[PDB]
Amino acid sequence: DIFNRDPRDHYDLLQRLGGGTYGEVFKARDKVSGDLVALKMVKMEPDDDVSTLQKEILILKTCRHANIVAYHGSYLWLQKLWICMEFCGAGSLQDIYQVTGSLSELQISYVCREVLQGLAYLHSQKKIHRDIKGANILINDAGEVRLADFGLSFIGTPYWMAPEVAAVALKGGYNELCDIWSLGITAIELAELQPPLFDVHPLRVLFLMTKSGYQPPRLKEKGKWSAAFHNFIKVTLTKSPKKRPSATKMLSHQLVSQPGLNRGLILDLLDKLKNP
Ligand SMILES: OC[C@]1(F)CN=C(Nc2cc(F)c(Oc3ccnc4[nH]cc(C(F)(F)F)c34)c(F)c2)OC1
């Protein structure tokens, strides 16, 4: 459901957060709640069809889980769409680790369980995130973890595309289990400050993956991590999606099911951020 009103009534905008990849996102206080919200402002061109986004907004609203950024309500007004969202004060894990350096085996483990909690719920709703990485895992001042979900014309013009071709332009080859893979890369990203093959051209990384011989990547330093963290990487990055375990199966992995995993590990992290 979309509300048709100036949202500058309801909310005072307190600080501009957004930059390159996030675009325009504002920290804002709710005039009624007195509560803190993130307002993501979307720019809309005349020939941008509104009715097509209303289909992508349902998905955001009926996504109700602690481990997913809560949707509050969209606002169309003056050729702009403002999406109101749970605020996460520490921004993304990427913002964090670029200052704090590498995350610890136990820090990464709690992040891997909270994410799986969110993916396991998404999947149960037959939804697929498509973009698990550091930049899309957000952190609140409590040190709790929240998956940011978001929601091309030069893939071709569709008018001539045959239907099977059009089926892929919307769906990609994406599968619920492709989100699991991305977590494995993300875990390495948290460990190493960059995903495998960051120093390699993207096209080449795409070719290399589609070679028959392609080898799932690994943690650089053997001794630095437990057998558990090693096995978590091995299993999440299984090549064949037919054999890659689901998010519930992964929640019963020893790396994420161990005790002592909780938000303190991150509060540590958020302290490390204040006091270098
Ligand atoms: O281009 C990258 C930079 F220049 C360097 N760092 C950032 N950090 C950054 C900036 C933002 F605006 C972010 O968005 C939020 C911030 C707080 N609470 C949020 N709740 C939901 C969101 C989101 F809109 F879904 F993302 C959100 C964010 F998560 C991180 O972006 C600038």
Side-chain angles (χ1 to χ4, degrees), residues 1-152 154-276:
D1 205 29
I2 293 179
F3 308 97
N4 281 275
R5 184 64 66 183
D6 197 41
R8 281 183 161 286
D9 293 327
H10 300 45
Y11 301 102
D12 315 270
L13 285 81
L14 303 173
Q15 197 157 54
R16 191 168 174 281
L17 307 185
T21 192
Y22 307 101
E24 300 229 60
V25 188
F26 286 98
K27 183 199 182 176
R29 170 152 284 115
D30 200 317
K31 283 196 179 174
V32 173
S33 313
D35 276 34
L36 288 169
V37 288
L39 283 167
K40 169 149 193 149
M41 184 264 281
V42 187
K43 303 183 177 179
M44 260 178 39
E45 286 290 336
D47 59 353
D48 266 310
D49 213 299
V50 183
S51 198
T52 43
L53 281 172
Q54 286 187 19
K55 300 188 177 170
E56 298 250 345
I57 286 293
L58 289 168
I59 293 182
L60 271 77
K61 176 165 182 178
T62 60
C63 269
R64 300 184 195 168
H65 199 282
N67 280 129
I68 300 183
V69 191
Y71 170 92
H72 283 151
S74 289
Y75 289 85
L76 196 69
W77 185 265
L78 204 69
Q79 296 161 341
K80 280 174 189 185
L81 181 61
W82 303 75
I83 317 179
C84 187
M85 277 167 137
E86 181 173 354
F87 181 71
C88 309
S92 60
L93 281 184
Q94 193 170 308
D95 290 328
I96 286 166
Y97 71 57
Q98 285 178 343
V99 184
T100 61
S102 342
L103 273 58
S104 75
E105 190 181 310
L106 281 178
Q107 286 181 347
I108 292 161
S109 295
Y110 156 82
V111 168
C112 280
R113 185 199 58 193
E114 291 283 91
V115 171
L116 285 169
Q117 252 139 218
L119 298 180
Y121 162 81
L122 280 192
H123 300 169
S124 57
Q125 318 302 266
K126 296 193 186 166
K127 176 62 191 175
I128 314 158
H129 189 277
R130 300 198 182 194
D131 203 13
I132 298 292
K133 48 192 247 165
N136 296 327
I137 306 168
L138 310 191
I139 297 301
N140 49 25
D141 297 320
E144 304 174 323
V145 176
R146 304 279 184 272
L147 286 183
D149 199 334
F150 293 88
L152 255 59
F154 284 76
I155 191 164
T157 325
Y159 299 128
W160 297 261
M161 280 162 45
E164 70 272 56
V165 172
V168 158
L170 298 173
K171 292 188 182 188
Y174 289 109
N175 170 50
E176 56 160 73
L177 296 180
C178 85
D179 277 336
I180 297 311
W181 180 282
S182 291
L183 181 65
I185 300 301
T186 299
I188 292 187
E189 170 191 10
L190 294 181
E192 298 186 10
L193 269 61
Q194 264 162 54
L197 306 171
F198 209 71
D199 58 318
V200 178
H201 201 291
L203 213 69
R204 194 162 282 119
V205 187
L206 282 192
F207 287 104
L208 279 170
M209 293 188 83
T210 71
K211 261 63 187 196
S212 194
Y214 183 62
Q215 287 281 316
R218 286 188 183 169
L219 279 167
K220 295 291 176 169
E221 308 199 316
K222 288 174 168 164
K224 187 155 176 166
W225 317 105
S226 66
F229 188 12
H230 280 289
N231 177 257
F232 188 77
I233 297 306
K234 182 195 186 188
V235 118
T236 49
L237 305 185
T238 107
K239 203 172 161 186
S240 182
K242 295 186 171 166
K243 290 165 186 202
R244 194 172 313 129
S246 64
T248 64
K249 191 174 164 166
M250 286 314 298
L251 284 166
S252 299
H253 199 256
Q254 193 216 342
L255 183 71
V256 296
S257 67
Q258 72 192 294
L261 301 183
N262 70 61
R263 62 190 192 98
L265 303 176
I266 308 306
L267 282 184
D268 256 31
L269 196 53
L270 302 179
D271 159 68
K272 185 168 190 164
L273 194 73
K274 288 185 194 172
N275 309 314

